Amino acid sequence: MPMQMFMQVYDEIQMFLLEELELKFDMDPNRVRYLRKMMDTTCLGGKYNRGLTVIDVAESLLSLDGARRKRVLHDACVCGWMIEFLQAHYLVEDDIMDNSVTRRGKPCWYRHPDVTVQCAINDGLLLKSWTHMMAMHFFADRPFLQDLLCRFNRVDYTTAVGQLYDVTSMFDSNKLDPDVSQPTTTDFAEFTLSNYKRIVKYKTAYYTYLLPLVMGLIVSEALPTVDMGVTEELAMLMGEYFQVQDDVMDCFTPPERLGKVGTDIQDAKCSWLAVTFLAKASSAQVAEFKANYGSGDSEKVATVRRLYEEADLQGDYVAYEAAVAEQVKELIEKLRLCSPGFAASVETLWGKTYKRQK
Template sequence: MRSPIERANLVSRVEEALSVFLTKQRDRLTRIDAALTPIADSAEMFILGGGKRIRPAFAYWGYRGAGGADDDTTIACVASLELLQASALIHDDLMDDSDTRRGEPSVHRRFANRHSTENWAGPAEEFGAASAILLGDLCMTWSDELFSGAGMPAERISAARDDFDAMRTEVCAGQFLDVLNQVQRDNSIERALKVARYKSAKYTIERPLLMGAALAGGSDRLREIYSAYGLPLGEAFQLRDDVLGVFGDPEQTGKPAGDDLREGKHTFLIASAYQASDQAGRRLLDGSLGDPELSDSGIEALRELITATGALATTEERIDRLADQSAQALRDGKEFIADEAAVVLDDLADAAVRRSL
């Protein structure tokens, strides 16, 4: 955005809206039974304990770009995207068997640890998994409740409903394709890009923008501009995430180094390495990718292969091309976007690719 202060202000307002909503949900849960207190605690810790609030930011400025006026009701409505994001992350960590999220135990690990501490009956891992599934489902339900009940006029919610619903279907479809890739060992670039598009690109940037435009009654032409800007930017955002998943600093990513390699993510980065590798390189990828016990030296060997094949450079080049494509679409459509929003969307694009949001 135009300044760190403005960015922090929007994040603060989103978090306040989420805090108010989660307090209401805590009261609802604990009235059912005090034993549900850990569910409320975990929801608050997970949702309020970190995150860049990227999706609400794009939805809000998509709304402002369509002529929408600033108000707390809109902030609460777009904050619903953080509940959807929480659902996706909780389930994603469970499917990937991830130990941490943002440097803290993942939800299923947290509940499994509680089971062990309390010396309850049955396997701790099964209790942790069941708890994470249910909390993720609850967050998905809550996202709809906050979206619909934030106080926006009914006709505006109705107008944005198609994008909100499509976004939830698309992210689940992309997640399934991601899981399918791992078991099928699909190393095609085409499938890797489709996963990136539906698991992240559309859900992170394009759909929030379109949802914001619909909330403000934006034109079809504006929606076309937002898609031309948001889709390549969303793909660039995911490709940057894929690079960080292999080469990122755990202090910044909040996950162990090389975690994507141990989880066996078949990303564009990995597909590019596979396509460019010789027979020995492919044997290394086949034998190491997806090994949960992969050693630090094994991770380093894969990193060296990815770099040597040119896959890292290819991915960085694609990120740059996509970022340029997005910036050009924004420039071409600038006359249709409210001035302040156009400036902020330009800044958001740069921050999304550099991951400085």
Template sequence: MSRQFVRSVIKNLKGEVCHLMSNSLKGREHEMFHSRLEKNFAYNMGDGKCARAALGMDIYNALCPTATEEDKTNAAKVCITNELLQTFLLVTDDIMDNATTRRGKPCWYKLDGIGLSAINDGLLLDSAIDQLIRSVISNHPKKDAILRDVNETKRVTIIGQTLDSLMAGIDGCTWERYKQVVAHKTSHYTYLLPLQLGFHLADRVDYKELDDYLDIFGDHTITGKTPTDIAEGKCTWISCKALDIMRDPKTNQNLLKEFTNNFNKEDDKCVARVKEIFTDLKLDSEFKKFEKTESDEMEKLLEQIQVNEVRPILQDTLAQLSGRKN
């Protein structure tokens, strides 16, 4: 229900965001800017899953079951700023990764007439976050706390983005780096910020009790089997685990040599060979073992959460994360 509600709010939010960002302009300049931002918002914000905003709304609804429709709508707008943050990061990340598609369609910077000006378009979406929060909840007692946590999330995530882009290749595939990239680049804005927003919007202060439990969600942001990750030599769970296995003297050392020769190369044949090596190493099976161990531990920790309204939401999030629920 929260996801459907969030999507309905996003449809009506484009005009509000464009107005907030363009109200200092006049005449033709206003029309040009408004048109560009409207196109930017519609293209980049229209097809996401809205999982982060929906999680924030799930938390808010659980803590404020009697909230008015107006309060729910305003809460949704604030939670949607997390989607704006993610979209800003994806627009710029696609340029850094030289990606071609995003969500089944060409990346924004690949469109005719866009190019590297997409960097500025991403910054526009980012700057809209602060404007929207200040406009929607100008008198909310936790407004400053929300702005603080959103800005902290940006800082942490951009650090993770930087780590992810540095030192590609085998030398950069270490568990220490992987853990830090995941903790900074993904888990903070995917799990911690939605929780913070939900609690702040409900004017609750007991979310800090959950910080330790939120950390455990980070390791599940895994994948690392996409052609882009392989071609760019990204540090992922898959690449780190593969190297662990191949460096074992009991493993055929020719695999490590082949992996070294094909990993971090933008060549379809090289990417295909690396994927074959992943299959030969039975990494799918290895991941399932890891996931089962982690999920069991997470379930035990979640049972200890004292905020009863929130526990089932995090348990549901774990179920989706573990592939047990769509």
């Protein structure tokens, strides 16, 4: 049921936006068509975990006429797509930035035959603008609008900050200077777990876990009923774990199943595997890593991958996952004491995360 109403609102949203461009922006049929495909290709096809979470939270809180349920669930759907569109925006720009080839089992947007890189960048910008346009259209007379948009913007900002941390993680920060060029790090002195946790917290945790929960709370007019300090603890913990999984899958999950080809090794990214390996590797292991990491060369890439499974990074992963699962469990109970309905939706959200195969 959730999926069907969620998609119904997507058509409703798509109709409003496209018709508006046609009627108020003097847009031609050819560009309206291009934008429709852009929207479907960049916004659909994922797991919709962020969007569907808003709906489930809203529903879980609508008890603490029958029309209020309808308006609340519809508002939740719109918020769901605001987050999905926000991600679509970041994925379009992210793929360009990470030089990726595929996404969701298809070419990345900037990789489509008739999509130029220059237009792709702007297309990404349109995706973000659409989040504001839809919000203003549906939540015009809604009293929670300023707070809703205020939080949404803050999370948008946090994500951009995280992206900054991500794209500059492989360059000696002490030498970061706009006026002087610098090659990738060779000593990898900054590939630490501390630096890794910061990257992930900001680039993924906030928009993937905190935002969905928060928007679900707002449309249900129930944000002040929950322990926010515990909610953020959970959001951050789950988000970190989510990204660690994303990193692991990038290196070990076959594209066929993953839906995308990994670029972390080639992009010399400060991934969970990299920092974990480096912290435990011998000087010999580190030397070999240094002579193979950050290269497009298939064999060099293959060597890094082997260096990883010989340092038993899977054993570390299983131990990490267990540690997180334990903390999550505890935090969810603390949350359950005064916010049982909400703690339950958080449980369901963790159900879509713990040991996902994506």
